Amino acid sequence: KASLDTQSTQVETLKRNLIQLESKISEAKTKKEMLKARITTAKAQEQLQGM
Amino acid sequence: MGLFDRIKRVVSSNLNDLVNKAEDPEKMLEQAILEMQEDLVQLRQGVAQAIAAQKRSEKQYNDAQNEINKWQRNAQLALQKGDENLARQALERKKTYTDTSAALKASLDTQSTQVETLKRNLIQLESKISEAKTKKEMLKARITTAKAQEQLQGM
């Protein structure tokens, strides 16, 4: 029972860690999205040259 | 000295030759436009991905809220039980979860603001391509006038 309780506590922590990890990837994606927005501005400058 | 001097003469000739080969109004605009179109599609996909990512975060946030509610019920049960340790553990669990939920909500709000900006940017980008098309249309009209002059020669 003691081992099970410890195991139960451990799995819950892992699940919480997994959720945190999942949150971290979303944050990275958000950072990537900001970078993508910057790329569009560079593309716009190129478009002006074409005109 | 002349080696450096030789490069300058060569560079001017090389630069002039290179620009002339690629100096096509339609080709230059098209290449940039194609890249822009691809970028726009990628941006739209990214926005869709961001929305999907945001939805996943919301689901996680919803689960956390449900967990807090479950914890609250347990805390109430602990008080009825009269065990101090059980009640204390529940309170600690509620506080960390609440902080996490608040952080998630703040992140979600920021994400929501960011996706909206991207959507607005995409709309602006879409407007920009239309403007380019309008410019191209004006150029096309000019071409017809040139064709008319050629037609007169044929007569």
Author numbering:
A (entry chain F): 105 to 155
B (entry chain AC): 1 to 155
From the paper:
Reconstructions were also generated for the other six symmetries and complete ring models built. Rungs are maximally constricted at the top and bottom with internal lumen diameters of 14 nm and 15.7 nm, and widest at the ring equator between rungs 3 and 4 with an internal diameter of 17.5 nm. This unique asymmetric curvature is a feature of all Vipp1C11–C17 ring symmetries. The analysis of different ring symmetries, ranging from C11–C17, provides us with a view of the structural flexibility that enables Vipp1, PspA, and ESCRT-III family members to perform their functions. Furthermore, as each ring comprises between 5–7 rungs stacked together to build a dome-shaped architecture, these asymmetric structures provide us with a glimpse of the structural features that enable filament tilt in the context of an ESCRT-III-like polymer. Based on the Vipp1C11–C17 models, where helix α5C is positioned at the tip of the spike, α6 helices likely coat the ring outside surface and do not contribute directly to polymer formation. Consistent with this, Interfaces 1 and 3 linking the top two rungs were poorly resolved in Vipp1C11–C17 rings, indicating a weak interaction once the limiting geometry is reached. When membrane was modeled into the Vipp1C11–C17 structures as a 4-nm bilayer, sequential constriction was observed with the membrane lumen reaching ∼3 nm within Vipp1C11.
Proteins that perform these functions include Vipp1/IM30 in photosynthetic plastids, PspA in bacteria, and ESCRT-III in eukaryotes. Here, using a combination of evolutionary and structural analyses, we show that these protein families are homologous and share a common ancient evolutionary origin that likely predates the last universal common ancestor. This homology is evident in cryo-electron microscopy structures of Vipp1 rings from the cyanobacterium Nostoc punctiforme presented over a range of symmetries. Rings have an inner lumen that is able to bind and deform membranes.
